[PDB]
């Protein structure tokens, strides 16, 4: 970075100040200069000595120009090879060395130089009083006569010219504040000796506001009223009148850039509608930075329909022809520092070029995604890559571990067991397994190249690495050849300059990769600049094309002028001179030339108030000064004699128009002038359509005669969800959860629920848990080592406590068949593992009313089908659900109630909330008198218990946060609360009546 900055500074020295280089080539310093000379002069002298020692030619632009000027100052008229004439059109900044060279060459070739100064008279600075008499020369008109700055005797005599400084009395504050580059250029042009200068200054008739401003700039005057004396300050009829229907210059305060471009589009359509022979070629829209405005441009200009479409062409935007393979190659150069996160490697396989090279198709990408998600692949590619980061080599959760798991699962079956402490993966088993072979080929290539790209080699050995990367990882298609050739060209050019400059030492890869990435975004595109559409572009120096409508967008404070602070140790920032160029003066002069080049109408727009916090964000200083000048030199025709300040405030409020925050505001569509063309939002603004009807509708449903028991189980697991995905067959199936970042340190949720379920089902069978613990350890599911052992032993201690109680009340049993006839509706299905004492189920969870419902239904079916026995359930924290044996008539009556609830709930979203309604019913219903209570204190306790069960705490999720309820209602209204508690009381009271 130091060498690049120093080389840029030295090139700038070469162009701009050759005297310093001529001095430093000898070895002396320069007096009166800032710091950093003490290390910059020996650097330059050593560079000259080194480039002489390399045998490269000594000649350069610092010591060449003097010899060139001396050669052409005294010779024949035509030394051979010279052109007949050469034009310099539209450049308003040239170095003094270049101008000296041009006047030296001008005696031999006729050189036509074309320059657009906005002023007419002489508006430059002055060097010395002995130089002012030299400015008694004169421009010659093309046909008529000669003229210069007006009243040239007493103007030089008066305070127009300062003691040493520039023309302080130019008049026009716009010109004085902005033309900093133009003043230096005109001072350089009038300083030439042999130049023969001529003018062609076409006048502008002051009728419009814009033409008033342009004429004031041209004739170099100042019509702004300040009001030194009170008889001037009171009266206000001396400024020019402004037509209230005149819209040459307008300002548009907006809110957000999307709203800003939406306003601009409508105004351009209005301008095209008003002026008949205006075409979308002649309209330019100039943006402070195009990369942060282009998406909104594309969005609204594409969202315009066919009847209201005017074509756009976003020039000066950075090109991205094959962005995915560009990023793939940059990330592939970033290989040796990568930790190989599985998400990033799958984003690498998202590349179609590389997938086709390693023959994995889009069908196979989904299966690899699911297999990486489930198989436990998170970390570095090998064990060696884990050790290379100086970490403990655990072996598990690596890419090699996952691929070993996949291959071992192809050769194995998962029920057999581990082989080398790797539990095989049961999914990859058939013809789909060759995707694993292709993935392992990918990993072998990536591992070999991350080994190979590590060392530091000279540039001659860095030459073929890019070709090796491209032809080893990518399969060239018809689309990809452009990007691949461009990448090879840029890499070759970098190493070509490095080799031609005779560099010998070692070069690490990160340097070359950073240089390639920094060069790959320096190539803009502007092929479709003025090809016919509306020309969207960013503001660029020395590009002054006269258009009809100039629109400037995004002129907030700080955004424009675009800031570029100098390097600090630059030696032009300390002691500047005349022709020096800096970015602030550059951007100010571009604003001035944008004002001049607009021929018909102007459009300045800036963000007024931030849309988030509704704060205030000010316009740029340039727009503020323009508005101040307009207000200080105009007045509305009504208030002929009000005040200077009152007239200024009136015209400032008249010109600037605010804009609505959101497009469907009827202030947009109210008639007049600020009337949008967006017919799409007109019903939204005028409120011409009905609101949303309630989702609960009475649906026609007829109950069949054969209802399988799994239908009732799936229904009573969750009734509203069963209505959604069973009646009208909508299921809001959410996406898959993404790949976790790291290996499991702790296990929560489903990942431990499955472990507890398998452990409990093994422990009830009185089997040793060591085999299953080894199975999980080889699975890469438990935490590492001692932490895994601790977690396993505490889970063993809890499931042993549960399984003791399960064993103490268990008799071996078998299945049975179910076939009843309840209300004339047959029930089919099976019941698993019913024992002579009845139904036993064990489940590692907390006490849930939905599971109580499940056991109650499964037990009513059994008790209606004979079966004198009890039904028990065993849960965590010594939860329990016991039901006594009943009579057949009672069981059929209760099952009739459940089937009737099913047939109602398939037709309407039956409102049985199992957890919340269960908690409310448990609070209210008393098991002493077996009656429903009514006292207001217990009703209020049940109310707050129901709310605490509906919405949970901040770190538990209540039953409210579910899409099946959010689809029906958002905020729980008390009337629906009364309805749901009535339905839940109707349907859940057998459970709390018979729970013992």
């Amino acid at each position: 970075q130091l060498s690049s900055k120093a080389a840029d500074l030295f090139d700038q020295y070469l162009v701009y100040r050759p005297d310093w280089l001529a001095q430093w080539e000898t070895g002396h310093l320069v007096e009166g200069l800032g710091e950093a000379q003490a290390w910059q002069a020996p650097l330059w002298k050593a560079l000259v000595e080194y480039t002489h020692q390399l045998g490269q030619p000594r000649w350069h632009r610092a010591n060449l120009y003097q010899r060139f000027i001396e050669t052409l100052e005294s010779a024949t008229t035509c030394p051979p090879g010279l052109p007949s004439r050469v034009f310099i059109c539209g450049i308003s900044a040239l170095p003094p060395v270049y101008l000296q060279a041009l006047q030296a060459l001008g005696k031999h070739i006729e050189i036509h130089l074309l320059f657009t100064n906005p002023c007419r008279y002489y508006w430059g600075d002055i060097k010395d009083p002995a130089y002012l008499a030299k400015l008694l020369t004169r421009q010659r008109r093309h046909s008529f006569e000669d003229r210069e700055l007006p009243l040239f005797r007493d103007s030089e005599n008066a305070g127009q010219l300062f003691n040493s400084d520039g023309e302080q009395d130019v008049g026009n504050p716009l010109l004085a504040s902005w033309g900093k580059l133009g003043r230096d250029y005109i001072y350089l042009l009038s300083d030439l000796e042999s130049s023969q200068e001529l003018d062609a200054f076409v006048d502008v008739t002051p009728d419009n506001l814009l033409h008033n401003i342009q004429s004031d700039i041209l004739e170099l005057e100042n019509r702004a009223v300040a009001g030194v004396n009170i008889e001037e300050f009171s009266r206000s009829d001396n400024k020019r009148p402004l037509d209230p229907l005149d819209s040459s210059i307008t300002f548009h305060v907006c809110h957000s850039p999307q709203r800003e471009v939406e306003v601009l589009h409508d105004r351009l359509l209005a301008m095209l509608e008003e002026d008949p022979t205006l075409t979308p070629r002649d309209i330019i829209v100039m943006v402070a930075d195009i990369d942060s405005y282009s998406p909104f441009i594309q969005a609204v200009f594409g969202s315009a329909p066919a009847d209201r479409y005017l074509p756009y062409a976003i020039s000066d935007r950075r090109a991205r022809q094959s962005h995915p393979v560009l990023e793939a190659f940059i990330s592939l150069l970033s290989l040796p520092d990568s930790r190989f996160v599985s998400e990033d490697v799958l984003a690498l396989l998202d590349v179609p070029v590389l997938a086709a090279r390693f023959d994995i198709t889009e069908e196979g990408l989904r299966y690899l995604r699911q297999w990486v998600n489930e198989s436990g692949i998170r970390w570095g590619i090998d064990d060696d890559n884990v050790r290379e980061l100086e970490l403990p080599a655990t072996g598990q959760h690596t890419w090699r571990f996952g691929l070993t798991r996949m291959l071992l699962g192809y050769a194995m079956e998962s029920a057999q067991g581990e082989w080398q402490s790797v539990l095989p993966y049961d999914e990859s088993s058939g013809l789909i397994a060759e995707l694993v072979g292709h993935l392992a080929s990918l990993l072998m290539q990536l591992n070999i190249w991350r080994r190979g790209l590590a060392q530091e080699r000279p540039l001659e050995e860095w030459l073929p690495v890019c070709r090796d990367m491209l032809n080893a990882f990518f399969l060239p298609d018809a689309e990809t050849e452009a990007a691949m050739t461009l990448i090879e060209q840029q890499w070759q050019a970098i190493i070509a300059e490095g080799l031609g400059a005779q560099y010998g030492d070692a070069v690490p890869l990160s340097l070359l990769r950073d240089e390639l990435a920094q060069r790959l975004d320096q190539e803009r595109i502007s092929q479709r600049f003025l090809a016919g559409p509306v020309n969207i572009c960013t503001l660029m120096p020395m590009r002054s094309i006269p258009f009809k409508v100039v629109c400037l967008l995004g002129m907030n404070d700080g955004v424009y002028p675009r800031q570029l602070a100098p390097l600090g140790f630059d030696l032009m920032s300390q002691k500047p001179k005349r022709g020096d160029r800096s970015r602030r003066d550059d951007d100010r002069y571009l604003f001035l030339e944008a004002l001049i080049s607009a021929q018909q109408k102007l459009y300045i727009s800036y963000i007024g108030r931030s849309i988030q916090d509704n704060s205030e964000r000010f316009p740029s200083v340039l727009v503020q000064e323009l508005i101040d000048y307009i207000g200080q030199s105009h007045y509305l025709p009504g208030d002929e004699a009000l005040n200077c300040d009152e007239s200024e405030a009136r015209v400032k409020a008249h010109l600037t128009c605010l804009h609505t925050r959101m497009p469907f505001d009827p202030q947009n569509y109210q008639p007049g002038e600020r009337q949008s063309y967006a017919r799409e939002w007109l019903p939204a603004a005028s409120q011409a359509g009905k609101a949303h009807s309630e989702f609960v509708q009475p649906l026609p449903f007829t109950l069949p005669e054969t209802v399988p028991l799994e239908t009732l189980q799936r229904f009573w697991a969750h009734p509203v969800r069963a209505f959604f995905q069973m009646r009208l067959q909508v299921n809001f199936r959410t996406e898959d959860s993404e790949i976790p970042d790291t290996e499991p340190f702790i296990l929560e949720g489903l990942s431990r629920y499955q472990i507890n379920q398998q452990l409990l089902n093994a422990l009830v069978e009185q089997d040793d848990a060591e085999r299953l613990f080894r199975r999980f350890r080889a699975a890469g599911d438990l935490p590492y080592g001692a932490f895994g052992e601790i977690f396993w032993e505490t889970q063993c201690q809890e499931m042993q406590q549960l399984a003791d109680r399960v064993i103490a009340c268990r008799q071996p049993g078998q299945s049975m068949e179910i076939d009843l006839a309840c209300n004339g509706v047959q029930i089919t299905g099976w019941l698993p593992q019913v024992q002579p004492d009845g139904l036993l189920r064990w489940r590692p969870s907390l006490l849930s009313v939905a599971q109580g419902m499940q056991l109650w239904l499964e037990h009513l079916v059994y008790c209606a089908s004979g079966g004198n026995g009890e039904s028990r359930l065993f849960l965590r924290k010594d939860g329990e659900w016991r039901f006594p044996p009943l009579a057949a008539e009672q069981a059929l009556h209760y099952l009739s109630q459940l089937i009737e609830g099913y047939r109602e709930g398939m037709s309407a979203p039956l409102l049985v909330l199992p957890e919340s309604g269960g908690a409310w019913l448990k609070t209210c219903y008393d098991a002493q008198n077996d009656a429903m209570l009514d006292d207001d204190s217990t009703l209020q306790k049940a109310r707050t218990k129901f709310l605490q069960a509906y919405e949970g705490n901040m770190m538990v999720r209540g039953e409210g946060d579910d899409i099946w309820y959010q689809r029906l209602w958002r905020q729980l209204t008390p009337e629906t609360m009364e309805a749901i508690v009535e339905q839940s009381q109707r349907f859940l009271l057998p459970l709390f009546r018979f729970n013992q």
């Binding site: 509608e273 075409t279 979308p280 063309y677 967006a678 017919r679």
Partner: peptide, 25 residues
Amino acid sequence: AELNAKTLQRLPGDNWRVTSYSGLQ
């Protein structure tokens, strides 16, 4: 209020291009 959106009646743009022997070919 009573409100409506103005309608552009003429065609907004012409048919102009700079072709590079693509439309002809």
